[PDB]
Each structure stands twice: as C-alpha cells, then as structure tokens.
C-alpha cells in the first residue's frame, strides 16, 4: 500500500547523444548518436534508458519525413516516412523535414525557413505530452554555419505546484 | 462390396434398418472349421409398417 | 471458423498491449520512440 | 554500479563464453543393435550395455548402467550377452574367465576357466543322515543314514 | 504407339506441360540469412538509420542462426534487432509452418505416419489371434506350440517402421481413390510397398480351379522420407534378419512387413472371387 | 501434439542466446531487466 | 573477425586437464600427451597432484586397493586385505563396510568316499557338484 | 504468370511525318505525311505503328474542323468536320481550326491568334489521355513566316515514380 507512490511504469531503450562517439572529419566533430550499453559487475550488459525527451528529439530530428507531392514524382523507395504511421491513432506523421528545405539565396531566408521547419517538427514533443515549451534559438548567417541550440522544458514526477494555467503533461513520468 | 450393398438396400422405401447375418447363423463343415459365405446376404427391418 | 488471420489493426493493437503490459509495466507506447519501432517490427514479423 | 561501456568493448565487460559441440562416444539410437560392453552417450552421460540389445528396443534402465573409462565391472553371469576371451564374470559368487568367444546362452562350465583353491566344508548331522569328515585330503566326507 | 505408364486406371499414356512461370517461392527458399538482412529494409531512412543500415553484415554461426558480425567498431542500434527479428521469423517458419504442411499430405508425412494409419483405420490381418485360416497354415511371424500357432508382436527399428508406415499410407491413399480390380491397377496401388502380383498360369484359365498369384519383390529398399526441405529420401532396407532381432526360432529367416501388408490388401481386394490362392515364397535379399 | 513442441527450457535458452548474440553482442542478460522481459514475451509469442 | 560469436575448444575424445572442473573416480584425462586416470574423487580447484592420477591405457584394467574417498560403481572390483570385493550398489565414498561389498569366492574341491548306504558323486567343481544318493 | 507484364493492347497504324517524302516548291521543303509501309525478309509488307502521339497530333492539326455559324452561311459540303463525330460519346469535335483565323493587320495579333487556336486544339491530346503537358512556342513575325515548335510530353509503360500531383494519364500504353 503506502509504498504506492512509485509508478510501476518503466522506460525502454533511449537513443543518446555521442553514444557511438565523435567522428572527426576536419570540418568539426559530430556526435554519431546510438544506443548506450551499460555494463555490470559480472558481464551482463544492458541498454541505457536515460534522457527520454532528448531521445525523442533525436528520433524526430534525425529521420526523414514524407516528401511533398510534385509533378516530377519520387522514386518508389525514396519518398520518406515510416510505414508504421499507417497504424497509429493520433493522426500524425513521423520524422522531420529540415533536410527538405527549398534552398534559396539570401541565407537569412533560409535561416527563417529552417527555423519554421525545426519548430513545427519539434512541436510534436508537446503534442505527444513529453515536454511543455520546447523552443529553438537558431541565430547565425556566416557563410553557411548555423547554431541551433534547443531547449526542452520538463517537469518532475510529483506535482509540486498548485494553480497552473496549462494541464500537466500526460507523460510526466518520463521526467521530461 | 458388403457395406456398399447394405448402404444401397437402405434406400428402398420403408426399409428402416439393415443388419448383417447374426451370430447364431454361422456354419461349419464336417471337418470342424468355419465356412465363409461366397454370397452377400443380410436382413432388413421395416420397423414402421409391419 | 474458429481461428483466422487477424485484422491488421487488431493484430498491432494486441501486440502493443502485450508489449506495454508485460515489458513497460503499463506505460503507453509513445510514438517515434524506440518502443514504437520495436512494436512495429514485431507486428511486421507476425504479418509476414 | 552500471558503467557506460564504449564503442568496441563488450569482450571486456563479459567474457563471451564460446560455443561447443562434442559428440564423441556415439549417441544412443534405437536403429542399432548393441552388444554387452558397447558404450553410448545418452543425455550427456555415458552408459554401457549389460546385455545384447536387439535393434528397435527403447532405452530401458535395466539394459544400461553408467560408465567411467577407468572403472572395471565383473557383472554376474548373464545368458543374453556375448563375452569376449578372458572376460571375467561372477557365477554363484565365484570368479570365472571366458576361455573363448562365447555366444549368448546358458552357463556351460566347459567354456569357462575356473580358478580353484583346494577347499573345505563343515557339516551338521541330521535326524535322518549322519555326516562325517571334512573333505580335506586324508579325511574324505562320508555319510551314513 | 505411345508408351504407357501405369495409372489409377490401368495403363494410361502421360505427357508434360510447358513451364508456366508462376509458382510462389516455397519453404526451401526461406533462409535465415536471406531474410535476416531483408528485414533491415523495414526501418525508416535518415541520418540516424543510413550508416547502420549500410554496415549491416551477417554471418552464420555453428547452429544456423544467422547473427550479426560485431566487428570491433560496432555501434549498437536497432538495425541488429531487425536482423534478430528476421532470423527468428525464418526459424519459427521452419519449425512451425514447414511441419504441419508436410504432415497434411500422405505422400510427404514424416513424423505423423502412425496418426495417418489411425485415420485410415488400417488393421493388420496377421497380428490377430482370430485370423482367417485361408491366410496360411502358419504365417511368417507365428511360431508353433502344441495348441496351435502364436503370433509375436515385432517392434521394428524406428527408421524401418517409419519407411514402412509411409509406404503403407501412400498405397492406402491411392487405393481409396477407387481403382478397378485388374492386375495393372492393383500393382500400381501396391507399388510403394515394393511388391508385385504376378499370375502363375499361362494358358487361358477360366476353366480350371485355383487361379493363383505369387507376390514378387521389386526392390530390397523402402524409399524413405526426408524431414528436410532440400535433399533426397534416404532409402532403408525393407527386411529383417530373424537372428539379429533375437526372435524365436520357428519364424522365417527374413521377415518382410511390406509383403505382409501387400498380401492383406490384395486378399481383401479379391475376396469376392471364389477360387484364388496366394502362394507366398520366402525371399532372401 | 502434432508438430514437435520442444522442451520449454531449451527454447527459452535458444531465444536468450539469439538475443545476446545479436543485440548485446554476446553478453548475458541482467535478470529482471528490459531485455529479460522482452525475451520472455517473444517466447510467449513463439509458443502461440 | 565477428567478435561476438566465440568459438574454440574444438573437440577431443580424451579431455584435457584443467583445475576448474572436478573429477570423480575413474575419469580419464589427457595431460602432456599422456592419459591418466583419477584414483579418488578429486574436488574442483585442486591443482595437479602426482598422487591423484595414475597412468592408464584403455584395455589395461586396474584393481586398486580400497580407498576412503572414491565413488565406486556397481560391480566394480577393489582389493581389501588382499581379498577381492565388488560393490553391490552405486555407493558413495566412505569407510569399508561388508554390507556394501560382495566377497567374490573362487572354487572348492572336497574328497568323498562311498559309504555302505549312500553313494557320493562329484568333487564340488562347477558342472561336477557334490551329490549324494542312497 | 510471372512473365505476365506486357499489355495485351496493340497499336493500329499511325500517320507519320515524311512518310510520303518531302515536296520541294522553291519556297522550302514540306513533309507530306502519310502511311509508312515496312517490308519484311520475304515480301509481305506491313504498315508501321511507331510514334503514336505525333500521329494523333498530325491527325488533329491537318484536319479542318467545323466552321462557325456566319450570317451568309456555307456551301452544303464545305462546312468542315467529320460526320463520325455524331457517334462519339465524349462530346467533342474532331480537327483543328488554325486554317480559319480571321486574318488581320499587325501580324503580332495573328501570331497570338494562331497560338490560341493551336493550343486550344492540341489540348485535346491531354484530354484524350495521350500526353500530359503539350505546349507550343510560336515566336516570330518576319514578313509572314512563323515558327511553331511543338512539344508533346510523354510517359513510359511502367509507373516508375511515386507521389505525383496529377495521375497516370489514361492511355500510357501508347508510350506517349
């Protein structure tokens, strides 16, 4: 009984930044995310399950969404997306489309376009009920360099504040 | 052929049941060995008429 | 009669329910997470 | 206590116990007929037949006894087993050796080499027969009714 | 002219059709490796799935089980889980669908032959103590005792009994298709048992008593059965040495189950005929 | 039975061995973990 | 490479020696190209001791003197007080107890003379047993 | 069976450019289209069936359509068209009307009129379902000379593109 206060809900494997190490290519150092294997005292490895929200954000940013219908067409196998979206019930798509920007001159317009796309795609974190106020701060024009820091606002696993305007996220058990 | 003939004779009108030759109707020769019938014989019962 | 290949959506709903009840302790299958892909993959296996 | 491992680093955490497939000591199979002595491997345990087994019979506890390569066995004489030369057996708690290759059959003293020793015996008198002597040399056993 | 091959209706002539082209790929095709690597196609595409899906190598361990090759630069992802799901799937197909499709046909059943015999209600004539006297004075498996013969239940070796039951089931399935009772159709039915019926008489019979027929062996080997999906049925011998199996001495030197089953079937087929022997001869391999 | 129905323990050992050779790279599994429960489900699914 | 699928210990018929496994009595092991057999139930972890293993060839039987730390099979012969004894059941290690071992005799011959009223026959040998008839 | 894919639909004869050869008249060399007869190894001539779309376009451009009602009227037999149009079910007319332009001064205006007429007529290629993107590039004024380059966008006999705005036309078996 009284023990109750701890959800029996668990978390599955989570993709993590720099799980497979950096990859230098003389332009900089990338992250190459993947799955982190946590070892034990006596063999018995196990996949890690931390940073759930960042895991969803990586799953969203780093997967191509469906392309838009053009008169040119697409190769049967290049039109992006996931067939598993045919079975979900929330009536949404899976992935992002930052890599589908219609490039143009005057890189300020390209920056604004990428901002719009990244924000529209990351809003699915709030729509799923995992964060509350995800937001981006994409600001640069350089030659082509761009910085795109992302903030994923979260909660705790026990409602400690009374009288909020919104409504507790539906999945505040991941701790966001 | 025995079961075939029985299943065919069952189709006669008002034939209720069809039986084989009972046990009290076997036959033995002088030597004392059972004789197998070379014909096909059986009984029928018109249980709702006679 | 009796048993037959199940409606695709019903098959996936049952696989998702089993996965969330016997593994994730009852947590919902949040879309676009690794459990979403694992469930999709199991459903594909059963369909094949 | 859980520690993040690395790229390229399970050989360390675990010890990756390798596989193994050893099937020496041919497996028992009912398709074969076995002789007394034939050793087989069943369920990972070595057994040796206690009698000539004809093909088709299932695995029974009365036909196979456990085996260890350095362990000897002088089993009691059986009439259903094929004995090689100089095979020691125990008949009425007396040791005998096979003179030649014996086919299956009942005991025949002419085919078995006995040891000997000279011998003694003690006798008690009965209400109908009186016994005398001990059987040794010089005192032959006698009996008068 | 035409050259006729035996059939369920005597000696029909046969032919061959043209290779059409369409025949779904069957069990033989499925392999863990050919569809472990295939399942990697079910994942999405993007910078998170491109490299891992490109570096997906697959190898075979000892006991099949096409696994992924973890070279010392791996990157744990879901791609290897997809390899795992595909491999499983091939395994469960080969252990669940390939049997129960192999067992539903009397001409391919391997592990369910005794069940098929229970379906076909096959009873042996030589194994009952109340056997017909016209079946011989002492059947090959009966030994003699002061008060008559005594049948001895034989426990054939597992492989030989498997092959014998399979042959019996093939012949019973062919017979259930309603043959005409001439000699060619009878011989075609009992062919899987490797036994042929051949008359003894030459002159037009039909005027003499005793129209007898001897049974003659067509091979010393049952065609066996392969549990696998690619290969050839391994043949087994169709006979038994009496002394090796350690049976009583009065029995025949070589006991043939196929011969006894064939004799049962043909003596049941030609029962309505009033005058017919069947002279059985001891056949050594 | 008519197919084979292998020994349960052997089947679970084979499932766990496949999961360790593929996903965990050859290491055994922590009892009462996500992978342990995943293996148990698969097993239930293969039994069905 | 494939550093996740391990293989080795290829397959021998006589196993190699190793401290990690325990050997019961009668186990044969191969060490230094020589076949040895254990003279007592060796517990795991113990190092190779020259007094626990004796040279062995498959057709060379050995009737060892009875030991206090050996697991003997049924009908397995041992030498105790210069007499031969065979185990009656699959018995665990322990001290010698006659209720566990059958003593194996060999033979005996006696001298018999025909009396006035009973004729004696035989000398007690197998197939020629001592018999009497009035 | 698996070797199925071959539309059992065939193509009838087609009119072809320069089938009957050019006809020099000292102003230039025209085409004189007709029917091409293909010979064989051993006699046995046969009418060719290549280039279906251009054949339809020729049959459209080189056939006078019904003229418009005037106040004076037309001779009973000069009013263009084809009586066979009384039986088609698509409710359309057969032929073109570029030879009926009301000629005027300022040849730029006649150019625009010929453009309108030829584009209106050749839209029937898309309407019947044989092309998708017909278009002309009539550009000159000279003395009277004019170029009228015509493009007939086609497809192939196997849909190799996915996610189109339009649709596989109707008759993509002619290869267009």
UniProtKB/TrEMBL annotation, chains C, F:
It comes from the Viruses. Coiled coil: none annotated. This is Baseplate protein.
TrEMBL record, chain D:
Coiled coil: none annotated. Signal peptide: none annotated. This is Tail fiber protein. The chain holds residues 3 to 147 of 587 of the full protein.
Automatic annotation (TrEMBL), chain E:
Signal peptide: none annotated. Disulfide bonds join 33-66, 125-264, 212-277. This is Virion-associated protein.
UniProtKB/TrEMBL annotation, chain G:
This is Tail fiber protein. The lineage of its organism: Viruses, Duplodnaviria, Heunggongvirae, Uroviricota, Caudoviricetes.
